[PDB]
């Protein structure tokens, strides 16, 4: 159906042919556009991954047209930049929808003098890092690691990486933005006002408008960085001491050092402790620091490598060792299905509890389960809980992520056994993670913490506060009042959209 919507589009798009940016299931390149940024393969066989149209705007005016026609005739929009949402909310809906796909809005301009950049929402962080590196090796931006993450989604939900302890989240370093609200107005920080500019910086911008471009602060980094890659046996009692110390110290060591820890089973079947890190400093200083503060890791100089910050990004994207061209960061032409959940840890997990936790990896097939620690101290502890809607600051030792990966047979029953393994691991940890409410991280989206009910239900707001206070805490109620002002008719809505107050 949707005749009135589709006809209104070709009419309102300034013509140089609108049918070029409008893909429908008949068009042979519709399947390729849909698949290319379906980033979690578990949704490849999803029956709700069936937009009736995909629109690829080339200018702001195409977004305004798609917006105007969409509210006029009641059809539903899913915004997609990089497509990396872990629940695939940018390309799935239970009701008929179209995708507004921002891939062709990916222009980047950099001002080295004032250490700032403009990035359009369809750019990946790989393209941004490439542009920054071609300008200076003393400039960084703390986005994530994986080079195909879209800046559209990432900067609207937080953005954690190897340099967050030094610089804060990607959202903490946004200084302006171009946002298109429900009325089709193109606003920036001055005209959108401070409440809305607060809300889009980690509150989930897609609840409030279509971010056209972000303006970011570029940060100063030393020209060379040191990484280490290290593997230890979890059965080694000295590494168990290291993990004991890590829980208490990784969030409190030098802000220039961020250490990630992961666990998976290998090979007759044992658990590996995976340890990786970036240090904004020299190798000699890295070895002195880690040996004084984490001696049970037994870090050896052969585990450490000095390189430029952008090269450290390229290495952690699994290129290199025999290094490829820097233009690697531009190749978005990038495979197992996965489910993940996460938790905030504020008190060290007791040793016996961590053992039982990790023992659950044996119950999944070898190497499929994965448990990771991402430390939160440093700058994250110097920023208030309401500076932006992201509230997990001081008092958080690390974010604990659970993940299970698999190859999809088509068999629902066997796919459900993996979902059931994660749920089991998450339920077991209930008494040892944050409580009231159990915290979760927006950019590690998880529908199992709760979803919206129907917007006409009388308890739509309170139901939304179930997941809403897990992502945001007391910042949720301020997001609701802001949503009421900028989107009173609730055009921007999905399974975990901030609700506006019911109209009086
Ligand atoms: C797939 C993935 C994700 C990922 C990661 C590695 C991989 C392989 N590593 C991450 C990391 O190290 N640190 C981190 O904090 N997150 C990491 N992620 C997750 C990823 O960064 C987030 O999921 C992010 O939101 C993804 O953004 P992207 O833009 O790529 O994804 P999307 O599906 O298209 O959109 C995400 C949500 O935001 C809304 N959206 C998208 N664009 C806009 C604009 N322009 N305006 C408003 N809302 C927008 C989508 O509708 C969706 O809800």
Do 135 and 191 belong together in one domain? yes
Tell me how far apart the alpha carbons of residues 397 and 376 are, in angstroms, rounded to a whole number: 6
Q: How far apart are CA 38 and CA 488, in angstroms?
A: 31
**What does the alpha-carbon distance between residue 68 and residue 51 come to, in Å, rounded to a whole number?**
18
Of all protein residues, the one whose alpha carbon is nearest to atom 7 of ligand 1 is: 146
CA distance 365 to 89: 28
**Which residue's alpha carbon is at the smallest distance from atom 47 of ligand 1?**
206
Resolution (A): 2.3
- Which CATH number is 28's domain given? 3.30.43.10
Q: Residue 428 and residue 371: Cα distance in Å, rounded?
A: 14
Breaks (C-N over 2.5 A) in the chain follow: 15, 267, 334
The residue among 225, 286, 277, 280 whose CA lies nearest residue 246 is: 277
Query: Relative to the CA of 169, which ligand 1 atom is closest?
Result: 15
Half-sphere exposure of 144 (CA within 13 A, CB side): 22
Place of tokens 């932006």: 388
235 vs 230, 294, 365, 373, 419, CA distance in Å? Answer: 15, 18, 19, 18, 27
User: Same domain, yes or no, for 233 and 293?
Assistant: yes
174 phi, psi to nearest 5 deg? -95, 130
Candidate from 46, 85, 161, 342 with most ligand 1 atoms within 8 A of CB, to mutate: 85
Residues 110 and 203 in one domain: yes
φ/ψ of residue 374, rounded to 5: -120, 110
Distance from residue 416's CA to the centre of ligand 1 (Å): 25
Looking at 380, 408, 436, the residue that finishes a domain is 436
Cα separation, 252 vs 293, whole angstroms: 10
- Closest Cα to atom 48 of ligand 1: 206
Indicate whether 258 and 406 sit together in one domain: yes
- Contact status, residue 167 vs residue 173, Cβ threshold 8 Å: yes
What CATH number has the domain bearing residue 259? 3.40.462.20
Q: Which atom of ligand 1 is nearest to the CA of 160?
A: 15
User: CA-to-CA distance for 241 and 236, rounded, in angstroms?
Assistant: 9
Measured at the CA of 267, the angle between CA 263 and CA 269, to 5 degrees, comes to: 70
Residues with CB under 6 A from ligand 1: 39, 78-86, 89-90, 102, 121, 144-146, 149-150, 152-154, 156-161, 205-206, 210-211, 443
Structural domain range at position 201:
106-223+308-334+437-504
DSSP codes joined into one string, 255-317: TTEEEEEEEEEE---EEEEEEEEEESS-HHHHHHHHHHH-GGG---GGGEEEE-HHHHHHHHT
State the burial class of residue 235 (Cβ atoms within 10 Å of its Cβ: 0-12, 13-18, 19+): exposed
Q: What is the CATH number of the domain that holds 321?
A: 3.30.465.10
Atom 12 of ligand 1: nearest residue by CA position: 144
Given a contact cutoff of 8 angstroms between Cβ atoms, the answer to whether 55 and 9 are in contact is yes
Beta bridge partners of 337: 406
Q: Give the position, in ligand 1's atom list, of the atom nearest the Cα of 212.
A: 45
Contact 472, 449 (CB under 8 A): no
Q: Are residues 326 and 387 in the same domain?
A: no
Strand, coil or helix: 340: strand
Per-residue tokens: 37: 């940024």
Ligand 1 centre to CA of 120 (Å) is 14
Round to whole Å and give the CA distance between 310 and 325.
Answer: 12
Q: What angle do CA 174, 121, 14 make, to 5 degrees?
A: 130
Contact predicate 491/70, CB 8 Å:
yes
- Token representation of residue 329: 């960061």
376 and 248 within one domain = yes
Q: Which helix (H) or strand (E) holds 484?
A: helix 475-486
Helix (H, G, I), strand (E, B) or coil at 156: coil
Dihedral pair phi/psi, residue 465, rounded to 5°: -70, -15
Boundary residue ending a domain (78, 105, 132): 105
Q: Are 75 and 144 members of one domain? A: no
Shared domain check, 233 and 218: no
Q: What is the DSSP letter of 150?
A: B
- Choosing from 66, 84, 105, the residue where a domain stops is 105
Q: Are residues 34 and 166 in the same domain?
A: no
Tell me which of 35, 43, 46, 79 to substitute to probe ligand 1's pocket, judged by most ligand atoms within 8 Å of the beta carbon.
79
Q: Which of 158, 153, 112 is nearest to 135 (CA)?
A: 112
**Dist CA 194 CA 201 (whole Å):** 11
Q: How many whole angstroms from 124 Cα to the centroid of ligand 1?
A: 10
Number of domains in the chain: 3
Nearest to 79 by CA among 95, 60, 103, 58: 103
Distance CA 229, CA 219 (A): 25
Atom number of ligand 1 nearest to Cα 102: 45
Q: Are residues 167 and 264 in the same domain?
A: no
Sort residue 93 into left (φ over 0), alpha (ψ -120 to 50) or beta: beta
DSSP state of 499: P
Find the angle CA(178)-CA(499)-CA(194) to the nearest 5 degrees: 35
Q: Which residue has the tokens 């195409």?
A: 62
Reading the block at residue 479, the tokens are 């997001």
**Whether residue 126 is found in the same domain as residue 197:** yes
Experimental method used, please?
X-ray
Same domain, 267 and 385: yes
Q: At what angle do helices 351-359 and 412-429 cross, to 10 degrees?
A: 180
Return the number of other C-beta atoms located less than 10 Å from residue 489's C-beta: 10
Sequence-distant (6+) residues with CB within 8 A of 28 are none
- The closest of 143, 102, 100, 98 to 125, measured between CA atoms, is 143
The gap between the terminal CA atoms of the chain, to the nearest Å, is 33
CA of 15 to the centre of ligand 1 (A): 32
């Amino acid at each position: 159906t949707h005749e009135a919507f589709l006809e209104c589009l070709t009419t309102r798009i300034p013509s140089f042919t609108p049918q070029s940016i409008i893909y429908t299931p008949d068009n042979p390149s519709y399947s390729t556009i849909l698949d290319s940024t379906t980033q979690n393969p578990r949704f490849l066989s999803s029956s709700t991954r069936n937009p009736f149209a995909i629109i690829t705007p080339l200018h702001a005016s195409h977004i305004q047209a798609a917006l105007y026609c969409s509210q006029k005739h009641g059809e539903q929009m899913r915004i997609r930049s990089g497509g990396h949402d872990y629940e695939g909310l940018s390309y799935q809906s239970s009701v008929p929808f179209f995708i507004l796909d921002l891939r062709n809005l990916s222009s980047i301009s950099i001002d080295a003098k004032s250490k700032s950049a403009w990035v359009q929402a369809g750019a990946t962080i790989g393209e941004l890092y490439y542009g920054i590196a071609k300008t200076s090796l003393n400039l960084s931006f703390p986005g994530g690691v994986a080079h195909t993450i879209g800046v559209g989604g990432q900067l609207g939900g937080g953005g954690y990486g190897y340099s967050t302890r030094k610089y804060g989240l990607a959202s903490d370093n946004v200084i302006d933005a171009q946002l298109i609200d429900a009325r089709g107005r193109i606003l920036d920080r001055k005209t959108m006002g401070e409440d809305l500019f607060w809300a889009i910086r980690g509150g989930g911008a897609g609840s409030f408008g279509i971010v056209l471009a972000w303006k970011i602060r570029l940060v100063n980094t030393p020209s060379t960085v040191t990484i280490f890659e290290a593997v230890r046996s979890w059965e080694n009692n000295t590494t168990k001491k290291f993990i004991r110390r890590y829980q208490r110290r990784a969030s409190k060591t030098d802000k220039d050092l961020t250490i990630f820890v992961g666990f998976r089973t290998t090979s007759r079947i044992s658990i590996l402790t995976i340890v990786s890190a970036t240090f904004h400093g020299s190798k000699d200083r890295l070895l002195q620091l880690v040996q004084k503060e984490f001696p049970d890791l037994g870090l050896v100089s052969e585990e450490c490598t000095e390189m430029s910050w952008v090269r450290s990004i390229i290495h952690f994207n699994l290129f290199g060792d025999e290094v490829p061209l820097e233009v690697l960061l531009n190749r978005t032409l990038n495979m197992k299905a996965f489910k993940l959940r996460s938790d905030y840890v504020q008190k060290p997990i007791p040793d016996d509890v961590l053992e039982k936790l990790l023992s659950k990896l044996y119950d999944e097939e070898t190497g499929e389960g994965y448990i990771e620690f991402f430390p939160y101290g440093g700058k994250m502890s110097k920023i208030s809980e309401s500076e932006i809607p992201f509230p997990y600051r001081a008092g958080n030792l690390y974010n604990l992520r659970y993940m299970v990966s698999w190859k999809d047979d088509g068999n629902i029953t066997r796919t459900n056994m993996h979902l059931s393994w994660i749920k089991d691991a998450y339920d077991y940890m209930t008494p040892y993670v944050s409580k009231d409410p159990r915290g979760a991280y927006l950019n590690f989206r998880d529908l199992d913490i709760g979803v919206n009910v129907n917007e006409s239900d009388y308890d739509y707001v309170a139901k939304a506060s179930v997941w809403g206070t897990k992502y945001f805490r007391n910042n949720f109620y301020r997001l609701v009042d802001i949503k009421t002002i900028v989107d009173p008719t609730n055009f921007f809505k999905y399974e975990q959209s901030i609700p506006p107050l019911p109209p009086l």
